[PDB]
Amino acid sequence: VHDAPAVRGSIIANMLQEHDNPFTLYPYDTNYLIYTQTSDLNKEAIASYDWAENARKDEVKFQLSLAFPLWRGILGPNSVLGASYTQKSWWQLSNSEESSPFRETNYEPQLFLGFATDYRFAGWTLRDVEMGYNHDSNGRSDPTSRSWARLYTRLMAENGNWLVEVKPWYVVGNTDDNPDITKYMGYYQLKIGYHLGDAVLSAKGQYNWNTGYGGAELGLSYPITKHVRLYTQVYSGYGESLIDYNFNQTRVGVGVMLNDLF
Numbered sequence: 495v496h497d498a499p500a501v502r503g504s505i506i507a508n509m510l511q512e513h514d515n516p517f518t519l520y521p522y523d524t525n526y527l528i529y530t531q532t533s534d535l536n537k538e539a540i541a542s543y544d545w546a547e548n549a550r551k552d553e554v555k556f557q558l559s560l561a562f563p564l565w566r567g568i569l570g571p572n573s574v575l576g577a578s579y580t581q582k583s584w585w586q587l588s589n590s591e592e593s594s595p596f597r598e599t600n601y602e603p604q605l606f607l608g609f610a611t612d613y614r615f616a617g618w619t620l621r622d623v624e625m626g627y628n629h630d631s632n633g634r635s636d637p638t639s640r641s642w643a644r645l646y647t648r649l650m651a652e653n654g655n656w657l658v659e660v661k662p663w664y665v666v667g668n669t670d671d672n673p674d675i676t677k678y679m680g681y682y683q684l685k686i687g688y689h690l691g692d693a694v695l696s697a698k699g700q701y702n703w704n705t706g707y708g709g710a711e712l713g714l715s716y717p718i719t720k721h722v723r724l725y726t727q728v729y730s731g732y733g734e735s736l737i738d739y740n741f742n743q744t745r746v747g748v749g750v751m752l753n754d755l756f
C-alpha cells in the first residue's frame with residue numbers, strides 16, 4: 495500500500511515505492527564525485543601519515559549514499575524501518591608521487607524509523623519525519639581515529655520550489671577520539687534547497703550558536719542528462735570531515751552528481 499506520492503526530495507516516500515529488481519537501491523543523501531581544491535590541507539592532524547608532508551591541496555571528493563528499506567509498514571502504512579549508508583571520501587588522486595592515497599573517509603550507517611507524512615504549514619508540507627541512530631567514524635586507528643554516535647530526528651518540508659530539512663541530534667556513546675566535537679559540529683544540521691527550473695541551488699550546514707564555530711556548504715547543479723548532473727560545490731568552515739572536524743577550510747570543487755536534495 496503506502497499512499498504518499500513521489501514528492502521530489504522525499505527520501506522516505508521514495509523508499510516506500512517498491513521496485514522489482516531487489517538490487518535496485520534507493521538514494522538517501524546526494525551522490526557525487528567532484529574534483530576539489532582546498533585552501534588548507536590539514537596535515538597537522540594527519541601528521542602521522544608518511545605522506546602528510548606531501549599532502550596536496552587538490553583532492554577528489556566523492557559521496558555515496560543509499561537507503562535500504564528493511565521493513566515497510568512496521569508502524570502503519572507509509573512508514574518504514576530503514577537503514578542508510580553514506581560515505582564521504584577525500585582522495586589525493588593527483589598526488590601519485592605518494593601513490594594516490596586517501597587522506598580520509600567517513601563511514602556513517604543509519605538505522606531509522608521513518609514516516610512519509612502530510613502536514614500543512616501554511617504553504618509548506620512536512621513530508622518526512624524520520625528518527626534513528628547514527629554512527630560516524632573514519633575507520634582510522636589512533637592517533638588519527640575519529641568517531642562519534644548520535645540519536646537524531648530528520649524533518650523534511652517543502653513549499654513548491656523550496657525545500658527545508660532540519661536534523662537535530664543528541665550525542666550518545668563514546669566520543670574520546672574527538673571529545674569536543676560538539677564545540678565544532680553543534681546540535682543540528684540545516685538543508686535548504688531551491689529549484690530554479692532544472693537548476694538546483696542548495697545549502698547544508700551546522701553552527702554551534704554557543705561556541706560560534708560551524709561549517710557550511712553551498713552548491714549548484716544542473717542536468718547533463720536524465721540521471722547525471724554537473725555539480726559545483728563550495729564548502730567553507732569547520733567540520734567538512736571528521737579528521738578536520740576542528741579544522742577550518744574553504745573548499746571549492748567541480749564534478750558530476752546523480753541525485754541532488756531534490
Ligand SMILES: CCCCCCCCO[C@@H]1O[C@H](CO)[C@@H](O)[C@H](O)[C@H]1O
Binds near residue numbers: 609611
Ligand atoms: C513524531 C512522530 C511522527 C508522527 C508521524 C506518524 C505518522 C502518522 O501519519 C500522519 O497522521 C496524521 C493524522 O493525525 C495525518 O494528518 C498525516 O498526514 C500523516 O502523515
